[PDB]
Amino acid sequence: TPKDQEIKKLVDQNFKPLLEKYDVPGMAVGVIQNNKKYEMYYGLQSVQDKKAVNSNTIFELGSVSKLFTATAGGYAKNKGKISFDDTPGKYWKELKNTPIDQVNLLQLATYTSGNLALQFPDEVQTDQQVLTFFKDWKPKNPIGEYRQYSNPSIGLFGKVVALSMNKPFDQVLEKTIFPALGLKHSYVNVPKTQMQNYAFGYNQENQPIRVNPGPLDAPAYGVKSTLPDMLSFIHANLNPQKYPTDIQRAINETHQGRYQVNTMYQALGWEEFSYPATLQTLLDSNSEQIVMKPNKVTAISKEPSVKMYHKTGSTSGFGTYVVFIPKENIGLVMLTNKRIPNEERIKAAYVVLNAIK
């Protein structure tokens, strides 16, 4: 059986049934193995337009956007534009000598400020309102010791990275970072000329929806991409030595674990695990306790030789999951235009990656 057919059968066995089960209109599943890419598309990018999911379909990546933010930070750091020991007021001057200026960039990127929640308050929308929010911020938990997954936190990180590179964040990605990764159809703002390819997302009643604009949206959850581009991103993560030095260092920077919450190593954007990882480890990483509540972090006291990495993402109408394993030279991308439980993403990817010859 040709290998493309093997992978396809595995994807059919493990991902395709999720479509019926969860009433998901459209799915794109990609596998890369030893630098060969395999693309599988199912269903519709727009139900009402009867438009099939295909290689040009653009999907909302949700929190997988944090991976690009992390990469941009890695790029800026390794070009000497920022140091992770800096504080935000060095760059956003209006924050100099305010309480948030006691939190360093690494802590912002990895969610350990000790007082930032998942979202900004709903009324925070404009740039002035974002500025005021951070001007007015006060500490709670000891800085650097507690992880609380947060959009504002990595949002501010991204904003500071953009300031350091003298360009708005959407330009850092569209003009620097996407091109450096060789991505040709990845966007912060999808242009009118590509809207025809932008999937509808579908909410829990299968009503068509797309992401709402939000404060510091772009670095937190605001990237949109295609299956081929995400495969290319995974390839870059699997093979950073094949890229020019500035982006190579940036990609490597994102793989570095910074602390642990039990079995989960928090890298920049990516989550990291000792490899081989059991399924339960991977599922534990996206438990309610990890994702929604604060957890005291521990210093890494066991650094494994071999790791794997993953990240989930959801917007209101989309799901994403990306995973890669350097030792096995393998990775997988799932994109859907409806959310499905993260545990079903992880398990299906687990089964497929462990069964591939």
Neighbours of 140 (CB within 10 A): 13
Q: Does 38 qualify as catalytic in the annotation?
A: no
Instruction: Name the experimental technique.
Output: X-ray
Resolution in A: 1.7
3-state secondary structure the chain: CCHHHHHHHHHHHHCHHHHHHHCCCEEEEEEEECCEEEEEEEEEEECCCCEECCCCCEEECHHHHHHHHHHHHHHHHHCCCCCCCCCHHHCCHHHCCCHHHHCCHHHHHCCCCCCCCCCCCCCCCCHHHHHHHHHHCCCCCCCCCEECCCHHHHHHHHHHHHHHCCCCHHHHHHHHHHHHCCCCCCECCCCHHHHHHECCEECCCCCEECCCCCCCHHHHHCCEECHHHHHHHHHHHHCHHHCCHHHHHHHHHHCCCCEEECCEEECCCCEEEECCCCHHHHHHHCCHHHHHCCEECECCCCCCCCEEEEEEEEECCEEEEEEEEHHHCEEEEEEECECCCHHHHHHHHHHHHHHCC
Q: Which of 332, 327, 329 is nearest to 353 (CA)?
A: 332
Backbone angles phi, psi at 217, to 5 degrees: -60, -45
301 is catalytic: no
The CATH label, of 3.40.710.10, 3.40.50.720, 3.40.50.300, 3.40.50.620, for the domain at 1-357 is: 3.40.710.10
Angle between helices 151-164 and 65-78 (to 10 degrees): 40
Distance CA 46, CA 217 (A): 24
Select which of 63, 65, 164, 314 is catalytic: 63
Q: Which of 75, 146, 149, 187 is catalytic?
A: 149
